[PDB]
Design a protein around this ligand. Structure first.
Ligand SMILES: O=c1ccn([C@@H]2O[C@H](COP(=O)(O)OP(=O)(O)O)[C@@H](O)[C@H]2O)c(=O)[nH]1
Ligand SMILES: *[C@@H]1O[C@H](CO)[C@@H](O)[C@H](O)[C@H]1NC(C)=O
Ligand SMILES: *[C@@H]1O[C@H](CO)[C@@H](O)[C@H](O)[C@H]1NC(C)=O
Ligand SMILES: *[C@@H]1O[C@H](CO)[C@@H](O)[C@H](O)[C@H]1NC(C)=O
Ligand SMILES: [Mn+2]
Ligand SMILES: [Mn+2]
Lengths: 590, 589
């Protein structure tokens, strides 16, 4: 770990802003020691070195000279390479380590991006932004004349002066190769703001040092992205190792293990077994599944995934460099194997304007695992040796419909009241014409109330015209924001399975349950093509917490209302849990 | 002067070259084992053999040296490594066939030395001489020479060959290095693994974690087993590295802009996609342990079939294994029932699961208690791999077929007009139609239309044949057409209800690979005088040779009478049977 020693320059106003971030971002991956340098002061959050006689004055002139002098005087023979860098730079330790290890440290090398004052043409200087790397020989030949360089100051730019010092004493100029502009990226032609925003550019991936990164939070974000890329590369390495192990066991005439065959994959015969593909144009998608609609617009998720896949293809195609350029996708195919991976057939339009196929494949790595609610193992075993779940509040808006009301409450009592299920029933009744069926509904409700005196059944005498949203909103308003509300419907029949699914699928502040109700066709829980169908377009039934409903803004009460609530829930950041619901079936009604 | 690449400017050479030493007898087995265990993980591997007995194995850089004596063999190998290659690599690894190489460990080692420090290095297991206190590297453990050392060694090769009388070749190399430059065998660390004769490979042994060579290996099977064990060790190391990276991301996440997005389980995998509109939401596909309720057929429920059932079983097994591992040894779980099962595919993340398991808890004492737990599984999406595929040219001679039956005479002109506008109108004669007449035991308009097409397009020619035989069985007609056609023509079996377009013609030409793939599209069905029908084959794009092979496999009559061409290619053929949707093929009735 005596290979590379990078000394990053900072300022008194940047110790707790950029220096700390850089120490916790890339100083943990540099193969060596990273030391922070600042100005002399008459409890800093970082261990920093105060160079005497140095003031925090931009441009950091003579501060870099003092730091180079310190580098030579303290760690000349303990390291091979020395990097001078700003606090607003991101340095990849591993890539830089390989790139520097491919070089001879005993030859005078003055690395950095070419900089193009007092420059007689033919010489240059490494730009101080991306980061300038010296060698041991450059230090040994230059540092005795750093004072001489300081006394012949010409320009007001520190990197120009350092390059001039190198050239005068060190027998080297900055590297002239165009590859430096890619390796040591400047990121200033675009992204004028001063912090890395577009992280999915080939320039970002292929660079070694990225600059500038003024915003510390964006520095942490870039570090997290780079570590995610490293994790993805390691996962691909695991897939390759599994493939090699499976093949190697095959060669040795031995049975492969279970973990090596599923991940070590390099005719279906039956007609209904071949997995059909989907057509993918530039901005349209065609599918054959009954659930999916044909000629659906290309979703933003699909567009982003395709863009990332094409970027990976271009990265892994230009590896033999001429410079291949991607323009558009004329058409494509996609087949998602649930347990193996994703297969693509992309007919790209590449530029060297020639089309090129690509039979892509994106395998699945080792699956991850997590328990939603971890339990106390120690407390469980003693209990083993030695309904009270979350209450669901059922809101039922009503208008008329005596017979369906009676059938609904018969089912409700038979499935909840005798089983003593932990539920609370709220009947929202619209007293049309201020009477009529209201009296009989009240009588039935009261009789069911005193028949089961521990039950929780309440009826709210709504007035006005029919409005699902208004009645639901005022029924909810009387409950606190940590109550589980179910937007049930009168013409529905459900079992305890639906109640458990509603309890589990609704996370307060995170998830909203939006089941796809099975609607019975015009003449039970037997699911068949003739019996009924899944109502995809039906968002009426909802299992949502009161706080989540308030955060979504509630119903508009102006007009379809369920769709508006769904859109508001999506906009609020909540996760809509759309899935099939086999525990409740909507009885047909004219 | 400016260069496009750093290599030319800085004089960067390739990192490592491996020079495997072999013989005539030991090449086709031990050399092949070495190649299959090492060459796919390295950059350049060169095999040096005394004589070439049989043909050189494919993809093997076999070099014929000339002599079988070990000292002369080593001398000639060094001469070749100096003459060719030579000043193109920084490190040279000379290893006999009877020594396994770790590849990954060797690469890490070579990356762990700098050019300035180890300018003249003689790496290997030290071994005492037999007056000089210097030591030489053992030949069977691999020798990592340096480019400068080889260059200085060059003018002394014949001198060393013609003076000393050492027996072993590695001792001769050590003597030559000592007498030419004076540097002995440096031990650093070079993690060598020695094997007792007749040993069984014990996977998980500590010595497999840190070792770059294994000596001696006497059979290819032993080499394969050693490579598998070292792969397991490297896999464990990679898992540990992944855990460390996840921990670092978790440590530094909460200061970032993403915050929870960066620290979203699993750590490192891309965060779940956030839908923008209602239509862009992702729907969980509910499934029990018996039936899947999201059927592409259309039924509300359908029993799990093939891939879905296998995936569900694998996920249940993985969940049970993970729970047992996590709760071991305090609690062991039992028979597992899938109460609720959800699965959706996130294109930017991978396939996700949300299971509701009704497990059973067994204490070591013996207590029994049912337990309900919810688990989440994610299959992350790995990197994109470009599968190799045979080259297919856009311009291919295509022969679109049509078994024009008796009742389809009315609709035949529509097919003829579509084919004309799709292929005949463009100047290129890229397609030709050979329609068939089913003269069941009177088609003047069809022949008149064909003649009109011929006169309007003098280059275009459309033939026709009169099958008097009944039984229009797809296979039967296809055999007759295949017999009366060349064996390399591109076949486009289009049904009468097909409206060809140039886009579909191009897709059939460029997705029907000769002897590798057969294209079976599905048209766009419509109601009323739309939908993508999945139970109709109709249009087929294959090759005559592939069809002949499938028919031969069938031969090696009820199947011939009740078999579809798509079903034939499905059963009696080992070809890719791509079944994709074609928006450019619209059908109606
Ligand atoms: O008054 C100042 C301003 C900046 N710097 C430091 O000098 C270097 C140059 O600053 P910066 O990288 O922000 O300039 P840029 O490269 O964006 O022009 C950095 O290490 C800063 O922390 C300094 O010491 N004093
Ligand atoms: C209930 O919680 C929600 C959560 O967003 C909040 O918006 C609302 O103000 C809370 N109401 C009360 C009365 O605490
Ligand atoms: C040798 O290895 C190369 C790549 O590692 C492979 O292409 C080739 O087929 C191998 N040859 C033999 C005989 O295994
Ligand atoms: C590195 O350079 C020095 C001086 O230029 C030279 O003596 C040494 O041999 C070089 N290293 C290598 C590995 O060639
Ligand atoms: Mn800067
Ligand atoms: Mn209804």
């Amino acid at each position: 770990r005596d290979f590379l020693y990078v000394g990053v320059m900072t300022a008194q106003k940047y110790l707790g802003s950029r220096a700390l971030a850089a120490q916790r971002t890339w100083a943990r991956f540099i193969p060596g020691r990273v030391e922070f340098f600042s100005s002399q002061q008459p409890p800093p959050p970082l261990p920093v070195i105060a160079l005497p006689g140095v003031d925090d004055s931009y441009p950091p002139q003579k501060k870099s000279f003092m730091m180079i002098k310190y580098m030579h005087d303290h760690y000349l023979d303990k390291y091979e390479w020395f990097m001078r860098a700003d606090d607003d730079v991101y340095i990849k330790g591993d890539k830089l380590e390989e790139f520097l290890r491919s070089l001879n440290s005993s030859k005078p090398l003055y690395l950095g991006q070419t900089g193009l004052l007092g420059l007689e043409p033919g010489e240059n200087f490494c730009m101080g932004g991306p980061g300038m790397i010296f060698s041991r020989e450059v230090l040994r030949r230059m540092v005795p004349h750093i004072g001489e360089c300081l006394r012949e100051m010409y320009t007001t730019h520190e990197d120009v002066e350092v390059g001039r010092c190198v050239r005068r004493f060190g027998g080297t100029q900055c590297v002239w190769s165009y590859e430096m502009q890619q390796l040591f990226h400047e990121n200033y032609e675009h992204n004028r703001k001063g912090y890395i925003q577009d992280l999915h550019n080939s320039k970002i991936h292929a660079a070694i040092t990225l600059h500038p990164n003024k915003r510390p939070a964006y520095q942490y974000r870039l570090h997290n992205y780079m570590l995610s890329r490293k994790i993805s590369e390691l996962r691909y390495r695991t897939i390759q190792l599994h493939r090699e192990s499976a093949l190697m066991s095959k060669l040795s005439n031995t049975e492969v293990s279970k973990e090596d065959q599923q991940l070590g994959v390099i005719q279906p015969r039956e007609r209904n077994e071949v997995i059909e593909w989907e057509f993918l144009t530039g901005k349209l998608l065609y599918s054959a599944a009954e659930n999916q609609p044909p000629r659906q617009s290309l979703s933003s998720i699909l567009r982003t995934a395709l863009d990332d896949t094409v970027l990976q293809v271009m990265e892994m195609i230009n590896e033999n460099a001429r410079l291949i350029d991607f323009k558009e996708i004329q058409y494509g195919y996609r087949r998602v194997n649930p347990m193996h991976g994703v297969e693509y057939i992309l007919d790209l339009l590449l530029l060297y304007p020639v089309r090129r196929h690509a039979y892509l494949q994106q395998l699945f790595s080792k699956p991850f695992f997590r328990e939603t609610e971890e339990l106390d193992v120690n407390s469980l075993v003693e209990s083993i040796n030695s309904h009270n779940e979350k209450k669901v509040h059922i809101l039922v808006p009503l208008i008329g419909r005596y017979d369906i009301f009676l059938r609904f409450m018969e089912n409700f009592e038979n499935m909840c009241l005798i089983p003593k299920q932990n539920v609370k029933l709220v009947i929202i009744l619209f007293s049309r014409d201020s009477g009529q069926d209201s009296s009989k509904h009240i009588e039935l409700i009261k009789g069911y109330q005193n028949k089961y005196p521990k039950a929780e059944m309440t009826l709210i005498p709504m007035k006005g015209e029919f409005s699902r949203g208004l009645g639901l909103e005022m029924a909810s308003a009387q409950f606190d924001n940590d109550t589980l509300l179910l937007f049930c419907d009168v013409d529905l029949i459900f079992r305890e399975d639906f109640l458990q699914r509603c309890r589990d699928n609704t996370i307060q502040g995170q998830q909203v349950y939006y089941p796809i109700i099975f609607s019975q066709y015009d003449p039970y829980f037997i699911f068949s093509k003739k019996t009924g169908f899944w109502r995809d377009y039906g968002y009426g039934i909802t299992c949502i917490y009161k706080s989540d409903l308030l955060g979504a803004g509630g119903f508009d009460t102006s007009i379809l209302e369920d769709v508006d609530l769904y859109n508001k829930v999506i906009l609020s950041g909540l996760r809509p849990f759309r899935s099939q619901e086999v525990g409740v079936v909507h009885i047909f009604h004219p | 002067v400016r260069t496009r690449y750093i290599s030319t400017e800085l004089g960067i050479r390739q990192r490592l070259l491996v020079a495997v030493l072999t013989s005539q007898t030991t090449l086709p087995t031990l050399g092949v084992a070495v190649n299959r265990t090492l060459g796919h993980r390295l950059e350049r591997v060169v095999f040096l053999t005394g004589a070439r007995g049989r043909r050189a194995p494919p993809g093997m850089a076999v070099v014929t040296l000339g002599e079988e004596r070990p000292i002369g063999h080593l001398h000639l190998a060094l001469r070749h490594l100096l003459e060719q290659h030579g000043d193109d690599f920084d490190w040279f690894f000379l290893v006999p066939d009877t020594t396994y190489t770790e590849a990954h460990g060797l690469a890490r080692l070579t990356g762990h030395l700098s050019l300035a420090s180890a300018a003249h290095l003689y790496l290997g297991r030290p071994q005492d001489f037999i007056p000089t206190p210097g030591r030489y590297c053992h030949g069977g453990f691999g020798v990592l020479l340096s480019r400068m050392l080889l260059q200085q060694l060059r003018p002394h090769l014949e001198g060393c060959r013609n003076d000393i009388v050492s027996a072993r070749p590695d001792e001769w190399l050590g003597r030559c290095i000592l007498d030419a430059t004076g540097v002995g065998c440096t031990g650093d660390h070079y993690s060598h693994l020695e094997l007792s004769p007749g040993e069984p490979v014990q996977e998980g042994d500590p010595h497999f974690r840190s070792a770059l060579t294994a000596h001696p290996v006497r059979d290819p099977v032993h080499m394969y087993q050693l490579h598998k064990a070292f792969a397991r060790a490297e896999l464990e190391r990679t898992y540990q590295e992944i855990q460390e990276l996840q921990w670092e991301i978790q440590n530094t996440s909460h200061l970032a802009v993403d915050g929870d997005q960066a620290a979203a389980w699993p750590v490192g995998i891309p965060a779940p996609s956030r839908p923008a509109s209602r239509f862009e939401v992702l729907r969980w596909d509910y499934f029990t342990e018996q039936h899947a309720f999201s059927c592409a057929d259309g039924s509300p429920r359908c029993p799990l079939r093939g891939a879905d059932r296998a995936d569900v079983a694998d996920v249940l097994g993985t969940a049970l294994e993970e729970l047992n591992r996590r709760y071991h040894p305090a609690l062991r779980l039992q028979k597992q029932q899938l109460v609720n099962g959800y699965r959706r595919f996130d294109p930017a993340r991978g396939m996700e699961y949300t299971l509701d398991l009704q497990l059973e808890a067994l204490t070591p004492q013996g207590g029994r208690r049912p337990l309900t737990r919810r688990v989440q599984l994610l299959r992350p999406l790995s990197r994109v791999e470009i599968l190799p595929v045979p080259y297919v040219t856009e311009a291919s001679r295509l022969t679109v077929l049509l078994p024009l039956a008796a009742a389809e005479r009315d609709l035949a002109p529509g097919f003829l007009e579509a084919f004309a506008t799709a292929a005949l109108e463009p100047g290129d004669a890229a397609a030709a139609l050979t329609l068939l007449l089913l003269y069941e035991p009177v088609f003047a308009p069809v022949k008149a239309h064909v003649a009109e097409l011929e006169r309007r397009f003098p280059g275009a020619r459309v033939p026709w044949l009169s099958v008097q035989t009944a039984a229009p069985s797809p296979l039967r007609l296809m055999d007759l057409l295949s017999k009366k056609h060349p064996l390399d023509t591109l076949f486009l079996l289009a049904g009468p209800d097909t409206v060809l377009t140039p886009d579909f013609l191009n897709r059939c030409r460029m997705h029907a690979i000769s002897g590798w793939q057969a294209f079976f599209p599905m048209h766009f069905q419509a109601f009323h005088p739309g939908r993508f029908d999945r139970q109709a084959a109709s249009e087929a794009c294959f090759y005559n040779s592939d069809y002949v092979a499938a028919r031969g496999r069938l031969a090696a009559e009820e199947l011939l009478e009740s078999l579809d061409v798509y079903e034939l290619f499905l059963h009696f053929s080992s070809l890719h049977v791509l079944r994709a949707v074609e928006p450019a093929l619209l059908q109606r009735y």
